[PDB]
Amino acid sequence: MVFEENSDEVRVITLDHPNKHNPFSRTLETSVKDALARANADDSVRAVVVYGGAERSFSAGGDFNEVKQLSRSEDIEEWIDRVIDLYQAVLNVNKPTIAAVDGYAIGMGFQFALMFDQRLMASTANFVMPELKHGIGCSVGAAILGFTHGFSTMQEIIYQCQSLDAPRCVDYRLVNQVVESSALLDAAITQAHVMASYPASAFINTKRAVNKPFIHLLEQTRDASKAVHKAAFQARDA
Amino acid sequence: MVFEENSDEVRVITLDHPNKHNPFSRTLETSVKDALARANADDSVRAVVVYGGAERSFSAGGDFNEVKQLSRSEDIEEWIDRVIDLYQAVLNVNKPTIAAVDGYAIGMGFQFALMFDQRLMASTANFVMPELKHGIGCSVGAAILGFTHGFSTMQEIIYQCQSLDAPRCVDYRLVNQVVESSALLDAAITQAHVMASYPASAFINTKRAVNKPFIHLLEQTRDASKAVHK
Amino acid sequence: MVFEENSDEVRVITLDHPNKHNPFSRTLETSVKDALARANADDSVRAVVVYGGAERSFSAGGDFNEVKQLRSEDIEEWIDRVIDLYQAVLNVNKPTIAAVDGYAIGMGFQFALMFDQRLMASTANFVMPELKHGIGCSVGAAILGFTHGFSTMQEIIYQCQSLDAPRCVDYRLVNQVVESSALLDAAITQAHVMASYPASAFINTKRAVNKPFIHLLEQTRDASKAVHK
Known part of the structure; x- marks a missing residue:
């Protein structure tokens, strides 16, 4: 569910879920985590780019319907462990990491991107943290954004649930660069070369x-x- | 010292101190704290708006020769407790809270507004943290603003002691929206409806x-x- | 290694390393730390300005070649020197103003972040190029993450770019930008305001x-x- 390509010392990992929005299914998470771990242990790799692919989204994130329908406390826990493990996987790569964001980065996709050392997005891309609008708890997104961008920016984003276009993302300093879709992957590889040096x-x-x-x-x-x-399910299951 | 109104599931609390600047006297603190506690416990209430009232200030803050003449150990601490208790009262509201800021938000008024989930201000409103300029300690305002907006922005605000107009507040990200005074309350209620949903x-x-x-x-x-x- | 002058209740400390870029040698650090302590203990001083001098840099920072070559007594000793320098600034309980002209690089950049306010010249530059030069930046990262938050810190330390006046305004690294010839007076002016x-x-x-x-x-x-x- 990913492909791995090389621009010399730069490993490029392209997300390749059957769906073009790259939803974080269990399988996609695992492929990403495994690819990252290979990149980190491969001495021939000196920097890593993650990209959703051309005409695809970075990640529409996890299925909100699936999470609301989870019937056991343990189901949601295993899911929280998955989410946090995904992000730790990225933070634990000790080589430069660059996220090349096109299409949508929603929820987990937005949080995922925040784990990378640098982010570039397409001028036509969008970041969204719409959890609350959809009745999904946003405590993980909130903790992450509050760490990365401070409390008040986090509050604004998580409570307004707006689609954040390129200019809005520049304004929030959520990304380091904005380029055209057709130039994005190359711009990301270029920055990966710079940091690999x-x-x-x-x-x-x-x-x-x-x-x-x-x-x-x-x-x-x-x-x-x-x-x-x-506690929620302790009450219900009584 | 407040009036409580409803736009369906939105509770609107308007500060109504005798003085149009809504200085945080002990009476106004108590009224606000009491209203917030009612809003929090009332199941019919799904969001909360706090507003200084038309042609009034959100709050010019605490009585400031009161704190200079405040001089006894017990008295200054009583007062620190009041201040923190006031802010905790807002933070502990478990439904959406919106501050609609017109006129001045100075000192405690500024700090008070930072406790809300979202802030809108009028285009003619001002935020000020002038404590140091006036020989008043700002360690509480510093702590808050350092938490909400980070250290360097806090330093700038507390050490410059400038009147922060709407554009300056937008630039600092102190507020989420700027509108005309006459549209402010309605814009705040609208946002409270969105967050209530x-x-x-x-x-x-x-x-x-x-x-x-x-x-x-x-x-x-x-x-x-x-x-x-x- | 520094001059100490007064604009009434404002103490102006001008860094005067033999090198125009005011590199943080052990001697410069000690002179600065001593001048700061004097300023803090002198009752006649109500505010402090630190300035690299006219036609000089605020500080090009420490010698990266001397770091690349450091034994453990020495590596602990250098870290201690760096942190002690910055603590010296933070423990001045009167207003402190940094007037930044030319370069503020590495330690110079970190040093400036210790001041209550910063002004820079429109022709000055901030740089945190450690990683580009094979120098650890964990100290500069910790500091910038504290002062300016995580994502700004990441951007600065990973890009290793020369930050001109407009870029420093955009980052909110400085409070004011003025022309070199006006900088020291503007800094003294703000020091007077805060001293009052x-x-x-x-x-x-x-x-x-x-x-x-x-x-x-x-x-x-x-x-x-x-x-x-």
């Missing part, structure tokens, strides 16, 4: 130090998120 | 999780500020 | 404000060392 040792050590509090935050969020659901 | 359970849970570290910060601030004047 | 704030409220507020920054730096000191080992 940074001496690896100093980069690895720095990124580790940088990402450590983020990783810690996500682990706290893993634990904290399960808790309200344990 | 979010399924309550997911909203409540999310908000609790969102505001938890804010609440915790305020408690640390309560303890730190009182240990200063002690 | 009643001292007791100011001191107590600033202490509460800077406390989590100081704590962060201390955690960073320890972490850079736990790591080196």
Whole structure:
């Protein structure tokens, strides 16, 4: 559910769900996590680009209907572990990571992108965190955005549930660059080359130090998120 | 010192101090806290708007020679408790809260507005954190603004002590919308309806999780500020 | 290695390394830390400006070649020097103003972030190029993440770009931009404004404000060392 390509020392991972919006099914998560782990352990790889593919979305995220229909506390927990594991997978890559966002980055797709060292988007792309509008809890998205972009920006995004176009994303500093769709993947590879040229040792050590509090935050969020659901289903199942 | 009105499932609380600037006297704090607590417990209420009233200020904040003449250990701490209690009262509202800011939001008024889930202001409104300029400690305002808007933005605001007009507030991201005074309350009620339509359970849970570290910060601030004047 | 002058209640500390770029040698660090401590203890001083000097840089930072070559007594000793320098600024309880002309690079950039306010010249540049040069940036990252949040920090340390005046305004790294010839006067002016704030409220507020920054730096000191080992 991904393909792996190389621009010399740059590994390009293209998401290839049968659906062109790259919804994070279990299978797609696993393929991504596995590809990232291979990139990280492959010495020939010095930087990594993740891309939804041409005329596809970065990720429409997880199925909101599926999450609302989950019948057990444990179902939602295993799902929260999946979500947090996906993001930790990205944070634990000690080489430069670049997200090339086209189409939609929704929910998990938006959170996923925030794990990358740098983000570029197409001028025609959109970021969305619409969980609350759709009756989905947004505590994971909130914790992540509040860590990455601060409290007030997080509140605005999560409570307005708007589609954030390129100019809006520039304004929020959610992305580092905006380019045309047709130029995006190349622009991302280029930035990946630039960061791959940074001496690896100093980069690895720095990124580790940088990402450590983020990783810690996500682990706290893993634990904290399960808790309200344990109590909800304890009541119902009585 | 407040009036409570309803736009269906939206509770509108209008601050009604005798003074048109809605200074946070102990009476107005109590009325607000009491109204918020009613809104929070009332099942018919699915969102809350707080508004200073037409041709009034959101709040010019605390009485400021009161805090200079405030001089006894017990009295300054009583006052720090009041301030934090006021803000906690807003943070602990488990339904959407909207601040509709017209006129001035100064000091405690500014800090008070930062407790709301969303803020709209009038194009002719001003936010001010002038404490230091006036020889008033700003450690509580600093703590809050540092949490909500980050350290460097907080430094800028608390050390410059400027009147922040609508464009300046938009640039700082202190508010979510700017409208004309005459459209403000209606725009705030509209946003309260939008947020009220979010399924309550997911909203409540999310908000609790969102505001938890804010609440915790305020408690640390309560303890730190009182240990200063002690 | 520094000059110390007065504009009434404003102490102006001008960095005067023999090199025009004011690199943080051990001697410059010590002169600056001593001048700051003097300024903080002198009752006649109500505000502090630090300036690289006319036609000079604020600071090109530390010698990256001297870092690349550091033993553990020395690596711990350098980290300590860096953090001690910044704590020295944070522990000044009077208003502190950085007047940045020329370059503020690496430690120079980090140093400037310790001040209550920053002004820069329209022709000045901030740079955090450590990673581009094979130098660890965990200290600069910790600091910038604290001051300007995570995503801005990431962008700055991973891009390693020269940040001109407009780019620093966009990042909110500085409070004002003025021409080089007007910079020091504008900085002294802001120092006068902040010096007029009643001292007791100011001191107590600033202490509460800077406390989590100081704590962060201390955690960073320890972490850079736990790591080196």
